[PDB]
Amino acid sequence: ALAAALAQAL
């Protein structure tokens, strides 16, 4: 969940 959140933010 959080890995992906970060990926999308960037």
* AA letter at 2: L
- Token pair for 4: 């992906």
Distance between CA 9 and CA 1 in Å, rounded?
Answer: 12
- Tokens representing residue 3 in the block: 């890995």
* One-character DSSP codes across 1-10: -HHHHHHHH-
Resolution attained, angstroms:
0.9
Q: For residue 1, what are its two tokens?
A: 């969940």
Cα 9 from Cα 4, distance rounded (Å): 9
